[PDB]
Amino acid sequence: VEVLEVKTGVDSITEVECFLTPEMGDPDEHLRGFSKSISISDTFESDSPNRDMLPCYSVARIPLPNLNEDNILMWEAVTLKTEVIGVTSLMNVHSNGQATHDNGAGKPVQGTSFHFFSVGGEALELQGVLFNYRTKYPDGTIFPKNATVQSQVMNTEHKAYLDKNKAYPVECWVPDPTRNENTRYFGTLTGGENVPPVLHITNTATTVLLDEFGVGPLCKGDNLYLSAVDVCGMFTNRSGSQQWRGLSRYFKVQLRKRRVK
């Protein structure tokens, strides 16, 4: 595409607002936002995690006002506001928890977190990397196929599009840095089993999505792709079993019309 000038006028800008809900595994009808209790395999070879134990990337494809009827115009994503929704829910230390000590409060959600979001003009492009190439990933997930020991460091065969919900396990896939020219992505992994969630909320912070050349994501087919992961940590119930806990993510994206060839 030759990227030309921005269209002006009162009809030249539009706004997308939405919530992406987390996909933590949802082991039953009471546990939306949670995974199944985590089970530990005895060897690398025998690792066969249940689908309900594996958080997945969330993705929403958002149709935009149709341009060009049937050089064309494209919607350009310019700015993002985003935050995690329900951060105060983590102050519930009284429901079904493990006492920190005799007669104490419940242990809060804590441990490994992954907070991630992307805005793109097409599906997020993924690269597979495996902790353990011999993991058996379950039916109904989309996982790196024909894995080899090189899959534990870098196997260029594992390329995918984040093109389906409840499908792509977080632990198998990262944004592919060799692609995603038309996407802006941001993520942070905080490891460790006792690390505390640190979650900021405000309606005063804007992220600009333009690159060096002043160009934001350009929405192919008038479609905006939003992706997210918000694994906040693990919940510990009284027996000691632990479950991933996730929260929804709010997006507000401002777009403008741009001419291309």
């Epitope: 006492a99 005799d102 007669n103 104490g104 009284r238």
Partner: single-chain antibody
Framework: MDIQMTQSPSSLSASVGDRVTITCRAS??????LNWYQQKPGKAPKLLIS???DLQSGVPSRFSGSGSGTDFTLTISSLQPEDFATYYC?????????FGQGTKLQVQLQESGPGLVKPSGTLSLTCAVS?????????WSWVRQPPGKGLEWIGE???????KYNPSLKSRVTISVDKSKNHFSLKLRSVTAADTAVYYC????????????????????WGQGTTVTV
Amino acid sequence: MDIQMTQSPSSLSASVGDRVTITCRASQGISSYLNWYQQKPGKAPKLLISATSDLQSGVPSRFSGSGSGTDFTLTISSLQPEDFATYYCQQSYSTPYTFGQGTKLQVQLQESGPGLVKPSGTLSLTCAVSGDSISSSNWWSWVRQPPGKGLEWIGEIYHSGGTKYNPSLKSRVTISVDKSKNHFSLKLRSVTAADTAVYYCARNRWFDNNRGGYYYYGMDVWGQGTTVTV
């Protein structure tokens, strides 16, 4: 978590005006989660003390409890004639709830059902709750007492349908609730001789004692009881 509750002594003969002390022991530490009951002959158990030492409303000031973790004590200050009964400790720390074997010295629940069941058949009972809503924030429990034996917790249901079962009975028990009739029910499959007992229904409610930590539960209201023979 399996916790066994041992009391001492098995039986005690004493004279009016004496100071009586019954003790019990937990197979593992249970902090302060320990209840005491009084059972007069032919009657349902009556809750005396919850949370090691909190006296129930209406139990005379001569009763007191103490202890910690593994060892506890029930104490009568000066014995009187009405105190002839069997006294049971009950750990409330962890399900399945367990009682001691016993020491020989208004909300209303009523239970109904066949009374004779053929071996391998299905025991079925119903508890009618009066004076309170089933949708109150408590558990609705089944406890049984075999002939010449202590108390066994069967399981509990919450108004929302959630159940907790004794792992010894999980494979053949169902407990159900019908908010329509304000009653809850007990179904026990494949009965054998070991199931002959007086069955009780009971309210297992929590106490706002401001101690903190896990909810302190105690069964404070009991049905009359029904005998089921196989």
